[PDB]
């Protein structure tokens, strides 16, 4: 439980790699959901509780849902599965072996740069207000309502326009 | 490049309070005024100078005052103060709501035997100057000189000479 962040990171890497090695979409969407899960868990381990839960609530619940929705209602996994998944699986294995050996190579040349392995657990949190309330990302994200109002109004306009854009498109 | 100074373990070894957070949170209010001059002076030292290695002689005085305070509270009115923190620590967040009618008793005892009066509401969240005897420094950041601005050019702004000086497009 010191290797925590490195593990979550490697798993996000592997999710994006399974998306880059474009598989059948039904077995790529699972990789994407795993990617989002693990990335949120990384954020949480760092301390962005609000951000992680916002992700769980919006990314997955909002975007992946509709991705699968649209895909199903507008796609057919034609018989392009000439063992394509079974091939790219071994290809992924070869790539992950390449990456493992790549990191075991790098760690020699670079020691206190790319990665510090002997002391990996260190160097996640650098300082922290021990006696301080009001230090969670909720405040930064609430900023938009007192300062940085431009962000909020711009997102509002993005939606105000996306509605019209989508509807005028679909027709 | 450059050595760092540090004090020594064998010094700055004062006998701490080692008392619990519940007791501290219960007795705080009175300790807000009693033993306030010292604490305010110390916070001022720490905010003026960012050198904990220079703001130390104002910590042993603080702890000595707090101990000479808990000493009076041990001599007089001990059991009201023990039942008090045993009533507080029961809760989770240690709030001052579930112990009201176990508080005014202790307060009246402390009063009838001592010239203390529990501060009112909003009496500690107020800036109060503190008369000291040591000076205030400058360059606390140990900064360096500000490189000189660019010498400004000036003079009455008269017109061009012979024209735009462009290729035979005199005017």
């Amino acid at each position: 439980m010191n290797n925590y962040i490195f593990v979550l990171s490697s798993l996000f890497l592997v999710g994006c790699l399974g998306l880059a090695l474009k598989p059948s979409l039904i077995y790529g969407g699972l990789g994407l959901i795993v990617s989002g899960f693990v990335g949120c868990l990384m954020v949480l381990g760092f301390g962005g509780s609000f951000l992680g839960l916002m992700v769980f609530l919006i990314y997955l619940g909002g975007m992946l849902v509709v991705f699968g929705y649209t895909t199903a209602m507008a796609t057919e996994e034609y018989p392009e599965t000439w063992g394509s998944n079974w091939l790219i699986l071994g290809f992924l294995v070869l790539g992950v072996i390449m990456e493992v050996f790549l990191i075991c190579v790098l760690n020699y040349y670079d020691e206190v740069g790319v990665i510090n392995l002997d002391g990996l657990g260190d160097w996640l949190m650098y300082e922290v207000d021990d006696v301080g309330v009001m230090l969670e990302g909720g405040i930064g994200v609430a900023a938009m309502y007192s300062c940085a109002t431009w962000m909020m109004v711009v997102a509002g306009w993005s939606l105000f326009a996306g509605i019209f854009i989508i509807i005028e498109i679909t027709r | 490049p450059g050595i760092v100074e540090l004090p020594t373990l064998e010094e700055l070894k004062v006998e701490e309070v080692k008392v619990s957070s519940a007791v501290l949170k219960a007795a705080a209010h009175h300790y807000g005024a009693q033993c306030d001059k010292t604490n305010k002076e110390f916070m001022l030292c720490r905010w003026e100078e960012k050198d904990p290695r220079r703001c130390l002689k104002e910590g042993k005085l603080v702890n000595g005052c707090a101990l000479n305070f808990f000493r009076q509270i041990k001599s007089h009115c001990a059991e009201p103060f023990t039942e008090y923190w045993t009533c507080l620590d029961y809760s989770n967040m240690q709030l001052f709501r579930h112990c009201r009618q176990q508080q005014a008793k202790f307060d009246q005892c402390v009063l009838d035997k001592l010239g203390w009066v529990r501060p009112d509401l909003g009496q500690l969240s107020k800036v109060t100057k503190v008369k000291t005897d040591r000076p205030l420094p400058e360059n606390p950041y140990h900064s360096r000189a500000r490189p000189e601005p660019n010498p400004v050019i000036e003079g009455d702004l008269k017109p061009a000479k012979h024209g735009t000086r462009f290729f035979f497009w005199t005017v």
Binding site: - | N150, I153, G155, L157, K158, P159, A160, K161, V171
Partner: protein, 119 residues
């Protein structure tokens, strides 16, 4: 380029400092040319909308001409100002740093040898 010079009053067309410069006598050839441009533009618009040229849209032509001139005037003021500022800053820097410009006084053709190149 120079948009960071000392106190570049931002998005101000003509600072008050640009009243100590001789404005252009309205007979200026540049303004006159912009007038010709307005006239020819009215001509072209008429010939495109298939209209008698040189005898139609007189109000149109007047508007074109006067707009073109009313613009050219102040645009030209701004440009005169920019060139004045350039020259002033240049001369100021030269007066600051003379060593960067040794005032080499050339030699006479007596002392200097012009080599030959016949025919």
């Amino acid at each position: 380029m120079m948009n960071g010079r000392p106190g570049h009053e931002p998005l101000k067309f003509l600072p008050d400092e640009a009243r100590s410069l001789p404005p252009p006598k309205l007979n200026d050839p540049r303004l006159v040319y912009m007038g010709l441009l307005g006239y020819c533009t009215g001509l072209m618009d008429n010939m495109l909308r298939m209209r008698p040229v040189m005898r139609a849209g007189l109000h149109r032509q007047l508007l074109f001409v006067t707009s073109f001139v009313f613009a050219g005037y102040f645009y030209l003021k701004r440009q005169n100002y920019l060139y004045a500022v350039k020259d002033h800053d240049m001369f100021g820097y030269i007066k600051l740093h003379p060593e960067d410009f040794p005032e080499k006084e050339k030699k006479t053709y007596a002392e200097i040898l012009e080599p030959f190149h016949p025919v």
